[PDB]
Amino acid sequence: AEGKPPQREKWSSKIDFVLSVAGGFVGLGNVWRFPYLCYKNGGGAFLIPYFIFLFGSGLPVFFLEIIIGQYTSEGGITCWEKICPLFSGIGYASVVIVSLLNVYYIVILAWATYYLFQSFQKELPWAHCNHSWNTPHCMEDTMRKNKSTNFTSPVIEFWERNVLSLSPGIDHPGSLKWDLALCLLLVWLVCFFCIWKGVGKVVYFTATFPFAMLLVLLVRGLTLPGAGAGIKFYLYPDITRLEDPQVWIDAGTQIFFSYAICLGAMTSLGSYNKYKYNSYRDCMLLGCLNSGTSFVSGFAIFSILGFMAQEQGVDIADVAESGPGLAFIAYPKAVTMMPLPTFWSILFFIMLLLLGLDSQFVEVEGQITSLVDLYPSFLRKGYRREIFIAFVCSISYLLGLTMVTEGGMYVFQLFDYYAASGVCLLWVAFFECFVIAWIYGGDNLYDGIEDMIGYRPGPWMKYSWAVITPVLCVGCFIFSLVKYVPLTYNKTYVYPNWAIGLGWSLALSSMLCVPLVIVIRLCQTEGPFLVRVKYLLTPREPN
Ligand SMILES: CC(C)CCC[C@@H](C)[C@H]1CC[C@H]2[C@@H]3CC=C4C[C@@H](O)CC[C@]4(C)[C@H]3CC[C@]12C
Ligand SMILES: CC(C)CCC[C@@H](C)[C@H]1CC[C@H]2[C@@H]3CC=C4C[C@@H](O)CC[C@]4(C)[C@H]3CC[C@]12C
Ligand SMILES: CCCCCCCCCCCCCCCC
Ligand SMILES: CCCCCCCCCCCCCCCC
Ligand SMILES: CCCCCCCCCCCCCCCC
Ligand SMILES: CCCCCCCCCCCCCCCC
Ligand SMILES: CCCCCCCCCCCCCCCC
Ligand SMILES: CCCCCCCCCCCCCCCC
Ligand SMILES: CCCCCCCCCCCCCCCC
Ligand SMILES: CCCCCCCCCCCCCCCC
Ligand SMILES: [Cl-]
């Protein structure tokens, strides 16, 4: 009838938790989004707000999500019923955010698959510019300085004329690309078959190959000439850029995105932990590993960029796209200089695919588990769950088909900025921290943490939950709103008004779930307003 006793099968060993978390929040957000966002925001001044957010609101919120999941023993959509039923809309907002993120998180893997397929031939296409797709301006980067128009390198010509085939603006959708659609279908089929059945010895190889490949890339990048200028550009900050809301709104949002918080996945992962498991040290070490990985990789990219700038003769700020395609212009160029380029290119794209696939598996499984926990009778047992998973995957693929046309890069950039990024994360993080600090009780949460982990933590977590996170969120929100700046692609193309309206609607769709739930709960209860709000603030609504 109720079938509750099965509950949630706890992890077999803490190793399963460590590996699942590491594969969850260490993915493409460390090796693809961090370098290009750092490059876009001047470079060097991006680190101060980055570390300020990381040490004030990045790790405490992740630990709060994990500890809430371990405490309530419930997913990311039902745990708020046992904490604050009035503010139960946070779970729905997180579900919407992760659903919108999973749609566009796969196009990067589709591009990686296309590159890997194209790299299986004798000579790499992005090494010479005598191919058909090349324009009359392409000039080998070796001869660029010797000669002197606006010549374009073969690597960029390839990226913007074979994989992308860009169109003049979002007004023109061109025609659907079929090879990219096939790659998208292949990736989605692999993901569905992995989630459907299955999650010993290959798990020790999946979690070690990317780090070795990254170390090899770092060694090659540091060995290259001209790396000193790139490192200096990467590290030395520009204090005159901090007076712009873009730097802060990018650094804080990137910190929130890279830790996979405000998504309902960390809570679901922590829900499987034991009630007497010391998760504090493990969470701190995993956060340290994530931050260390994202920072070291940047040295490899910025040294390659400095070498490219020195070789071509142009400045370090005009050597690549400065957009969502920096990782497809920097690393493929460095692969060419290595001996036996094809082998290294294959290995690099394989590790990129693995890094993306692990995170995609984790997030999709978390979302499906939350939606199943919502309804544990109809969407459960046998054939009624696989059909639901297939329906979700098919709908996601059909929606993501919009980003593989001749003008899908603009839609991808709009999705990246507005959906699952920007102010929709700040809103949810602020509401979570404010509720936990000022309604349930930081002291009560600390008592529970001391009961379950064994020793009472320090005041850093309480202070960050109480004063440091909401202040930063509100300040960043107001600063961004007051000094409005429109979004542009490659700092040259300006979007139409309706595109900005669509992006703001995408953000508001996730943002507008808390007041709706508040109103519905208020009108679903009988009695005076004050009596209703007081009863809907009591933590133990069920049991
Ligand atoms: C909600 C789920 C089903 C997806 C929503 C349907 C939309 C977004 C999907 C379904 C069919 C897809 C279309 C199929 C064919 C074309 C032709 C091309 O000239 C423009 C892209 C376009 C138009 C695709 C874009 C995305 C598309 C319109
Ligand atoms: C009594 C409570 C549990 C009922 C919950 C249902 C209401 C509160 C929730 C459930 C999920 C929420 C929806 C999540 C997704 C969407 C799609 C978006 O395009 C419009 C908002 C909308 C429609 C949200 C509105 C409010 C919503 C429907
Ligand atoms: C704006 C500051 C960002 C970095 C600092 C975050 C919080 C630091 C800890 C707060 C508590 C101070 C005492 C901690 C050591 C005893
Ligand atoms: C981007 C819009 C759709 C994204 C997914 C939304 C589904 C989750 C919220 C609604 C599911 C529960 C509805 C019934 C609740 C009693
Ligand atoms: C815009 C992104 C959409 C991604 C796919 C939709 C995900 C959620 C749809 C199914 C919700 C089912 C709720 C429970 C129904 C019994
Ligand atoms: C008006 C000239 C033609 C424009 C063609 C539409 C381009 C793509 C717009 C749709 C992108 C978002 C899809 C829906 C997301 C919920
Ligand atoms: C790039 C460095 C990021 C480091 C983030 C974590 C620093 C906090 C110290 C963690 C040390 C190990 C755990 C000790 C017990 C709390
Ligand atoms: C089982 C304990 C937790 C597992 C993770 C431990 C990570 C320890 C810190 C390692 C930081 C290395 C950064 C290297 C970046 C390339
Ligand atoms: C003792 C008070 C601690 C902070 C209480 C919550 C602060 C919520 C935001 C208030 C405004 C912060 C600065 C915004 C500047 C635009
Ligand atoms: C922005 C988050 C907090 C918003 C709080 C107010 C939400 C709307 C409340 C209006 C209640 C109307 C129904 C009253 C029934 C007696
Ligand atoms: Cl990061």
Q: How far apart are CA 502 and CA 402, in angstroms?
A: 14
Q: How far apart are CA 100 and CA 411, in angstroms?
A: 13
- Beta bridge partner(s), residue 493: 489
- Beta bridge partner(s), residue 405: 176
Tell how far the Cα of 339 is from the centroid of ligand 8, in angstroms. 31
Q: Cα(first)–Cα(last) distance of the chain, in Å?
A: 17
Q: How far apart are CA 367 and CA 99, in angstroms?
A: 7
Q: Name the one residue in this structure whose structure tokens are 């003769």.
A: 313
Q: How far apart are CA 414 and CA 515, in angstroms?
A: 25
Number of neighbours of residue 127 by Cβ within 10 angstroms: 15
Nearest CA to ligand 9 atom 16: 475
Tell how far the Cα of 290 is from the centroid of ligand 11, in angstroms. 7
Ligand 8 neighbour 18 (Cβ under 6 A): yes
Structural determination approach: cryo-EM
Q: How far apart are CA 10 and CA 71, in angstroms?
A: 13
Q: Which atom of ligand 7 is nearest to the CA of 292?
A: 1
Kindly report the length of the chain.
Answer: 543
Q: How far apart are CA 393 and CA 447, in angstroms?
A: 42
Nearby residues of 49 by Cβ (< 8 Å), 6 or more positions away: 242, 247, 248, 250, 251, 252
Q: Which helix (H) or strand (E) holds 494?
A: strand 493-494
Q: Name the one residue in this structure whose structure tokens are 């202070």.
A: 463
Tell how far the Cα of 391 is from the centroid of ligand 5, in angstroms. 9
Q: Which helix (H) or strand (E) holds 488?
A: strand 488-489
Q: How far apart are CA 47 and CA 55, in angstroms?
A: 12
Q: How far apart are CA 294 and CA 286, in angstroms?
A: 12
Of 346, 366, 407, which is closest to residue 98 (Cα–Cα)?
366
Instruction: Tell me which fold the domain 14-535 belongs to.
Output: Amino acid/polyamine transporter I (1.20.1740)
Number of neighbours of residue 377 by Cβ within 10 angstroms: 10
Nearest ligand to the CA of 464 is: 3
Ligand 9 neighbour 288 (Cβ under 6 A): no
Mark out the alpha helices in 383-513 (DSSP H runs).
Answer: 383-400, 408-418, 423-435, 442-453, 459-463, 469-482, 497-511
Long-range CB contacts for residues 391-396, cutoff 8 Å, separation at least 24: 392/368, 393/188, 393/191, 393/192, 396/102, 396/103, 396/106, 396/188
Tell how far the Cα of 339 is from the centroid of ligand 7, in angstroms. 38
Nearest ligand to the CA of 48 is: 3
Nearby residues of 428 by Cβ (< 8 Å), 6 or more positions away: 90, 93, 94, 97, 262, 510
Give buried/exposed letters for 166-205 (b at 16+ CB in 10 A, else e).
bbeebeeeeeebeebbebbeebbebbbebbeeeeeeeeee
Nearest CA to ligand 5 atom 1: 100
Q: Which helix (H) or strand (E) holds 489?
A: strand 488-489
Number of neighbours of residue 358 by Cβ within 10 angstroms: 23
Ligand 4 neighbour 415 (Cβ under 6 A): no
Answer whether 166's CB lies under 8 Å from 160's CB: yes
Q: With helix as H, strand as E and coil as C, how does 264-309 read? A: CHHHHHHHCCCCCCCHHHHHHHHHHHHHHHHHHHHHHHHHHHHHHH
Say if residue 43 is exposed, middle or buried (CB neighbours under 10 Å; 0-12, 13-18, 19+).
Answer: buried
The number of angstroms, rounded, from the C-alpha of 195 to the middle of its chain's C-alpha atoms is 20
DSSP per-residue letters across 223-277: HSTTHHHHHHHHHS--GGGTTSHHHHHHHHHHHHHHTT-SSSHHHHHHHTS-TT-
Instruction: Name the DSSP class of 537.
Output: T
Nearest ligand to the CA of 532 is: 10
Q: How far apart are CA 434 and CA 423, in angstroms?
A: 16
Which amino acid does the sequence have at 110?
A: A
Of 360, 451, 319, 462, which is closest to residue 24 (Cα–Cα)?
360
Nearest ligand to the CA of 498 is: 6
Nearby residues of 239 by Cβ (< 8 Å), 6 or more positions away: 45
Angle, vertex CA 482, rays to CA 481 and CA 483, nearest 5: 95
Number of neighbours of residue 263 by Cβ within 10 angstroms: 30
Ligand 4 neighbour 102 (Cβ under 6 A): no
Q: How far apart are CA 288 and CA 59, in angstroms?
A: 9
Half-sphere exposure of 510 (CA within 13 A, CB side): 29
Nearest CA to ligand 10 atom 1: 515
Instruction: Name the DSSP class of 144.
Output: H
- Beta bridge partner(s), residue 138: 152
Q: Which residues line ligand 5 (CB under 6 A)?
A: 99-100, 103, 371, 375, 379, 392, 395-396, 399
Tokens of 487: 């979004």
Q: How far apart are CA 415 and CA 354, in angstroms?
A: 23
Q: How far apart are CA 67 and CA 52, in angstroms?
A: 23
Angle, vertex CA 467, rays to CA 271 and CA 541, nearest 5: 40
The number of angstroms, rounded, from the C-alpha of 480 to the middle of its chain's C-alpha atoms is 21
Nearby residues of 9 by Cβ (< 8 Å), 6 or more positions away: 272
Tokens of 204: 């020790």
Of 274, 287, 266, 253, which is closest to residue 359 (Cα–Cα)?
266
Tell how far the Cα of 367 is from the centroid of ligand 5, in angstroms. 10
Say if residue 28 is exposed, middle or buried (CB neighbours under 10 Å; 0-12, 13-18, 19+).
Answer: buried
Ligand 8 neighbour 289 (Cβ under 6 A): yes
Tell how far the Cα of 65 is from the centroid of ligand 4, in angstroms. 21
Say if residue 314 is exposed, middle or buried (CB neighbours under 10 Å; 0-12, 13-18, 19+).
Answer: middle
- Sign of the dihedral defined by the CA atoms of residues 371, 374, 377, 378, in that order: negative
Nearby residues of 199 by Cβ (< 8 Å), 6 or more positions away: 361
Answer whether 53's CB lies under 8 Å from 59's CB: no
Q: How far apart are CA 401 and CA 399, in angstroms?
A: 5
Q: How far apart are CA 136 and CA 125, in angstroms?
A: 17
Q: How far apart are CA 168 and CA 186, in angstroms?
A: 29
Tell how far the Cα of 173 is from the centroid of ligand 1, in angstroms. 11
Q: How far apart are CA 393 and CA 332, in angstroms?
A: 31
Tokens of 499: 């595109």
DSSP per-residue letters across 435-464: HIIIIIIHHHHHHHHHHHHSS---HHHHHI
Tell how far the Cα of 20 is from the centroid of ligand 6, in angstroms. 36
